[PDB]
Design a protein around this ligand. Structure first.
Ligand code: PX9
Length: 157
């Protein structure tokens, strides 16, 4: 109950496939500051299951290397809200998407990280505008964005 933008009418099957973390923001600098920061994660692909859960492939920098991760976000009664199982209850919210170009999401435990996902390794000014508007509300204190060259590299090097 801190992020209160969600996507009405979300069809989670339609988010399947390839995505690029074009921009990210968080409530605390420490959540994204170093390469190995806990929530500096780079999304690779979204794989919605038949039962409506959402499997997520990503990379993360750990121990001086770009590690692959696979995680599962389980559906809830709200179609735009999913839960991930770590030792704390942390939920994922889909704020807005057009399926074909962009998707905005936040994860929250208050600790909060949001990303602007895009389908192609290109700077979508309009997707970034909608991301910044969705965020102007929220209490973000660090924001990163990535150029096309970085978006084609593992962990955005
Ligand atoms: C529409 C769904 C977009 C994908 O949302 C998420 C992307 C990455 C996430 O990762 C959260 C942190 C994952 N852990 C980082 C530390 O290593 C273990 C995995 C969570 C949701």
């Amino acid at each position: 109950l801190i992020v209160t933008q969600t996507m009405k009418g979300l069809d989670i099957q339609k988010v399947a496939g390839t995505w690029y973390s074009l921009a990210m923001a968080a409530s605390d600098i420490s959540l994204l500051d170093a390469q190995s920061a806990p929530l500096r994660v780079y999304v690779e692909e979204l794989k919605p299951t038949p039962e409506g859960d959402l499997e997520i492939l990503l990379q993360k920098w750990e121990n001086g290397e770009c590690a692959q991760k696979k995680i599962i976000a389980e559906k809830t009664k709200i179609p735009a809200v999913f839960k991930i199982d770590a030792l704390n209850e942390n939920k994922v919210l889909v704020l807005d998407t057009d399926y074909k170009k962009y998707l905005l999401f936040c994860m929250e435990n208050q600790s909060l990280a949001c990303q602007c996902l895009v389908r192609t390794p290109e700077v979508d000014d309009e997707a970034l505008e909608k991301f910044d508007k969705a965020l102007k509300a929220l209490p973000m204190h660090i924001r990163l964005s990535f150029n096309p060259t970085q978006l084609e590299e593992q962990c955005h090097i």
